[PDB]
From a paper:
CD45 is a cell surface phosphatase that shapes the T cell receptor signaling threshold but does not have a known ligand. The primary role of CD45 lies in regulating signal transduction events within immune cells by controlling the phosphorylation status of tyrosine residues on various signaling proteins, such as lymphocyte-specific kinase (Lck).
We determined the cryo-EM structure of this complex and found that the E3/49K protein is composed of three Ig-domains assembled as “beads on a string” and forces CD45 into a closely abutted dimer by cross-linking the CD45 D3 domain, leading to suppression of its intracellular phosphatase activity. E3/49K uses a “beads on a string” interaction mode with CD45: all three domains of E3/49K protein converge on the CD45 D3 domain, but each uses a different contact surface, resulting in an asymmetric complex. The CD45 D3 domain contains three entirely distinct interaction interfaces with different domains of E3/49K. The E3/49K R1 and R2 domains engage the “front” and R3 with the “back” face of D3 domains in a perpendicular and parallel manner, respectively. The R1 and R2 domains share an overlapping, but molecularly distinct, docking site at the “front” face of CD45 D3 domain with ~ 682-Å and ~ 430-Å of non-polar and ~ 596-Å and ~ 436-Å polar buried surface areas, respectively. However, despite both interfaces centering around residues Arg399 and Ile440 of CD45 D3, they use starkly different detailed modes of engagement. Strikingly, Lys60 of R1 also forms additional H-bond with the other CD45 D3 domain.
Residue numbers in the entry:
A (entry chain C): 1 to 180, 244 to 324
B (entry chain A), C (entry chain B): 224 to 574
């Protein structure tokens, strides 16, 4: 008959079908799941047998009603499989950045996070080190599987350094000092006009949103006014809340988080 | 002394018994009411049918003659109404909906039925109530009563707890790409609770999305079109009964240049004895800021002619009669020349 | 006074006997009356022939001459009236019909005959009575009286059972076609009584119906033309005295796509010493939302030319003198590549 099964996340839940094998397992929407022992629609992780079905690593997309039928189709077994999410977990913050002062003409060793290899980046957005191999040789630095050694520290070696593991779960943050575009949060009153300033006057401006549809394109669901430099919002409603990123072809962009009062 | 006026302002309360589904009338008088026609022991009258008038003589020992009779009707319906939570799932964090559903029909008219709601410090008079802008993660309780002829006979309390919502937001430290197909995106996890870090990347036309674990903070994107701008939006999403996505942090980067693909529409035509016209279309993937086409003419695997032009239109002349030359045309975007496309063509002769 | 005046307003009651098929007439008087010629003991007279005038004399010891003369008209036979059920089979689910027929004629005239019918709370005066708006699966009771000149002489009653009918309505759970030739339709049995199901599939050309047992809940259509839309109508029917099928459920779905067949009449003709003209007709089974043609020209079992045209019209120029060429042309629907059509031809030329 009709049964309700809750289970938990990442649980291999087994649904028992009617007798008189073979059996077919379908859904109400119309997505084929199981045809006898053979499996159909591999994009959904599950396995089939002559009578029963098994779902592996269930999640939100599995919250539906599965119907199993015998060979003759005279009997039905409906199971309403829902998924209860686990309690939310608070992610532990990454280690706080620390400051290191290096004198001129000295070689400084910085320890990476445990777990080789250690990947080292800088604040300006360049790949300083990827494992043992060293990129950007002009900066005169070396890198083993664990640490990063700056040789003949410059006056321009001052800056931020980030060290990550192979999986990137952990992070270390250093600020090396040589010794001798923030997002804008805008609150807009409903039913008013909002002006957003884009990039410089040299180049066309392209806008994107969280919904991933360009606001300036025609037939947009929200009214707008796009020019080569600024964006105008007319009669702002509640649906205008979100984030809008405007960038030109010269690799210059700004992000505005619009919240409606 | 006189019973006529003493009980003129009496009050009658009606109680519904489910086991017998019957009505009991109780007089709000401390002293005993005694009757001879119907059983009215103590101060309660039993076995009364709804929507029917009954006559009962009311008298007391303290008050002497004359006597009097009272007429009573019974319209109160108790238990056919059930309280239901009509809260919308998409806005369950700050909105609480309470409704009353009737399951059994009754002979009572709706014009004499009222609903009163006491939710904490709020009082409402409506059959269905809505509450907006309620603080999340607070478990409240509210009482609802049904009044007939301005009397309390049905009341029900219900406890409602709000759901999770509004996660985020991630703080993208930096996004870039120092390789033709490899890009690096680095962010930080939001302080508030979230589940699994949905990240989307969009090129000029195409767009794709994926999910990342709550632990890792650095990600690398592969199979990226060289010299193509990409915009990435990352938002930490939690899975309630309705998935709450939260605000999204956006970043953009352009991939480094790479050698282009082969030239397209390599067309060669013969016009004169040793003059050949070679023209072609630009390659599908430019992978460079500049435009340039280089055509080399060889004979017997020996380079003998080499020309370059910003447009694919080359003329070949001054060649031996009936000789199988090889034309190799390639694209030089400025940094990394592309792989050449080679064809074989023969000449004509002298009159 | 006189017997004629005393018994002027005398009344007579007639009782019918089926064993003798005779009417006995009784005078509604208390005192005993004696008759001269015919014996009339007490107040009843027997052996009276139907539809014949009878003259009788009424007198009493308390009244003098003249004697009362009474004329009696005997009503016709009771058995000559028959009750017939005129209910139509097609409308037996909501209509009941009753009729009175006179199989055997009688000398009595038909002008003074009254038929009064009563079904439930409805009373009518007509020979044929018809009632509509009847709930299925119910039994009704009717009675009727037949009066001769507004004098009751026949009574009858009957019970009619309402035939079951109008089943349904089945609800289709879903319909789909995930394969190239297989489609799955799943429904739900109706609540009311039913026997079997009828499922009709209609396409752009033909419509065909099939019958299914009540036990079956799912069906799998097979041997279907790929990439075609079918509309399926399902209705449960019950074999009553006449077949009753209720309101149907309608759905529509299209199958998947399969590789197309080979092209037709791929004509190949000579154009010059190094050019060839290739044409072909579109395949009968498009099996796709797009039309495209791909041609591959090979020499010595080695591909040397690849072309793609929207129509089957290809020119093969700049070839080699005195050598063979194989043309493989196929139709592409945008989803699957069909079986190529292959031909061989020799460029039999010499400079
Ligand atoms: C200090 O670090 C800088 C790098 O940040 C090194 O000096 C200068 O590096 C810049 C940037 O790469 C060089 O400019 C470019 O370099 C190469 C050729 O060297 C080429 O890409 C360009 O033509 C351009 O010139 C610059 O030449 C270089 N200068 C010197 C004197 O090396 C430097 O090695 C570090 N150390 C010290 C002690 O300055
Ligand atoms: C549920 O069973 C599946 C199948 O065994 C497990 O998921 C992975 O499935 C692949 C493909 O069959 C196997 O190669 C892997 O070994 C399986 N993973 C593991 C960790 O064994 C899945 O783990 C099972 N889930 C539970 C909770 O036991
Ligand atoms: C369903 O799975 C079966 C295998 O279990 C696939 O192969 C069919 O197997 C049955 C017996 O189980 C044979 O009678 C058929 O001839 C097989 N081939 C078919 C139906 O094409 C089968 O292909 C799978 N799909 C369907 C729709 O039955
Ligand atoms: C949810 O579970 C499914 C089980 O199939 C995981 O697999 C993906 O499911 C989506 C949605 O149907 C498909 O589009 C993908 O093709 C499936 N495979 C892969 C490799 O992504 C899915 O990853 C799970 N989602 C999570 C854990 O967020
Ligand atoms: C499918 O499920 C059925 C029903 O559970 C299995 O049949 C029996 O299941 C019980 C469960 O307690 C086992 O103890 C028995 O041993 C099972 N009997 C047999 C004959 O298998 C059945 O095994 C499952 N698998 C298949 C392939 O049908
Ligand atoms: C920093 O490291 C550099 C690179 O190894 C050192 O420079 C070399 O020093 C060695 C001896 O240790 C010499 O043999 C090399 O000739 C040096 N290389 C150059 C290019 O000059 C440097 O001495 C280290 N500095 C400190 C302070 O330890
Ligand atoms: C309806 O109101 C009655 C009182 O008229 C409530 O009954 C009391 O409930 C509390 C707990 O909420 C108990 O401690 C008391 O003993 C109950 N009786 C009295 C006389 O106070 C009742 O809870 C309310 N709600 C419902 C659903 O009946
Ligand atoms: C799933 O949870 C519901 C909650 O109402 C419960 O009724 C049902 O029995 C559960 N099913 C299981 C544990 O299989
Ligand atoms: C998020 O996805 C990861 C990786 O698959 C998994 O371990 C984790 O349980 C998921 N979190 C939730 C809340 O489902
Ligand atoms: C959140 O992500 C889900 C899953 O992709 C999507 O269906 C939904 O539209 C997104 N937005 C909101 C507001 O839930
Ligand atoms: C060919 O000639 C161009 C100038 O026309 C020159 O830049 C180039 O180096 C020459 N060689 C090749 C191999 O392109
Ligand atoms: C429904 O029943 C009628 C007879 O009552 C029959 O003529 C008709 O064909 C049936 N319709 C079907 C089977 O679709």
């Amino acid at each position: 008959g009709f049964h309700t099964i809750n289970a938990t996340w990442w649980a291999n839940i087994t649904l028992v079908g009617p007798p008189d094998t073979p059996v077919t397992w379908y859904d109400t929407q119309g997505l084929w799941f199981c045809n006898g022992s053979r499996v159909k629609n591999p994009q959904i992780r599950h396995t089939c047998n002559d009578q029963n079905l098994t779902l592996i690593h269930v999640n939100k997309t599995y919250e539906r009603t599965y119907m199993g039928y015998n060979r003759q189709g005279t009997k039905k077994e409906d199971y309403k499989v829902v998924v209860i999410p686990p309690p939310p977990a608070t992610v532990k913050p990454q280690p706080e950045p620390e400051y290191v002062f290096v004198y001129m003409g000295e070689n400084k060793t910085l320890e990476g996070p445990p777990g080789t290899p250690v990947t080292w980046f800088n604040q300006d957005g360049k790949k300083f080190c990827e494992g043992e191999k060293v990129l950007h040789p002009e900066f005169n630095h070396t890198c083993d599987k664990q640490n990063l050694i700056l040789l003949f520290v410059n006056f321009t070696h001052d800056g931020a350094y980030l060290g990550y593991n192979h999986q990137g779960t952990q992070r270390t943050h250093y600020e090396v000092t040589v010794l001798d575009i923030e997002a804008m949060l805008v609150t807009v009153t409903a039913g008013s006009n909002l002006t957003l300033v884009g990039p410089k006057a040299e180049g066309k401006v392209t806008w994107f949103d969280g919904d991933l549809k360009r606001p300036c394109e025609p037939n947009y669901r929200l009214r707008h006014e796009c020019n080569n430099q600024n964006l105008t919002l007319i009669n702002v409603t509640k649906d205008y809340e979100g984030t809008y990123y405007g960038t030109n072809d010269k690799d210059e962009g700004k992000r505005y988080r619009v919240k409606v009062n | 002394p006189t019973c006529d006026e003493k009980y003129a302002n009496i009050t009658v309360d009606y109680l519904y018994n489910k086991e017998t589904k019957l009505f009991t009338a109780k007089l709000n008088v401390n002293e005993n009411v005694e009757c001879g026609n119907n059983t009215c022991t103590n101060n309660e009258v039993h076995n009364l049918t709804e929507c029917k008038n009954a006559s009962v003589s009311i008298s007391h020992n303290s008050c002497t003659a004359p006597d009097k009779t009272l007429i009573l009707d019974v319209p109160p319906g108790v238990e056919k109404f059930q309280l239901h939570d009509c809260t919308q799932v998409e806005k369950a964090d700050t909105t609480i909906c309470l409704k009353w559903k009737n399951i059994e029909t009754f002979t009572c008219d709706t014009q004499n039925i009222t609903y009163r709601f006491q939710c904490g410090n709020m009082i409402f008079d409506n059959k269905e109530i809505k509450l907006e802008n309620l603080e999340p993660e607070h478990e409240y309780k509210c009482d609802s009563e049904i009044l007939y002829n301005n009397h309390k006979f049905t009341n029900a309390s219900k406890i409602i707890k709000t759901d999770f919502g509004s996660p985020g937001e991630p703080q993208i430290i930096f996004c870039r790409s120092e390789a033709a197909h490899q890009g690096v995106i680095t962010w930080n996890p939001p302080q508030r609770s979230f589940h699994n870090f949905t990240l989307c990347y969009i090129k000029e036309t195409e767009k794709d999305c994926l999910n990342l674990d709550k632990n890792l903070i650095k990600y690398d994107l592969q199979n990226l079109k060289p010299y193509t701008k990409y915009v990435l939006s990352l938002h930490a999403y939690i899975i309630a009964k309705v998935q709450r996505n939260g605000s999204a942090a956006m970043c953009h980067f352009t991939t480094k240049s790479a050698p282009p693909s082969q030239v397209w529409n390599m067309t060669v035509s013969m016009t004169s004895d040793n003059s050949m016209h070679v023209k072609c279309r630009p390659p599908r993937d430019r992978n460079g800021p500049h435009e340039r086409y280089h055509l080399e003419v060889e004979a017997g695997n020996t380079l003998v002619r080499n020309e370059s032009h910003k447009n694919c239109d080359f003329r070949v002349k001054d060649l031996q009669y009936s000789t199988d030359y090889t034309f190799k045309a390639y694209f030089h975007n400025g940094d990394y020349p592309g792989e050449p496309f080679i064809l074989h063509h023969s000449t004509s002769y002298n009159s």
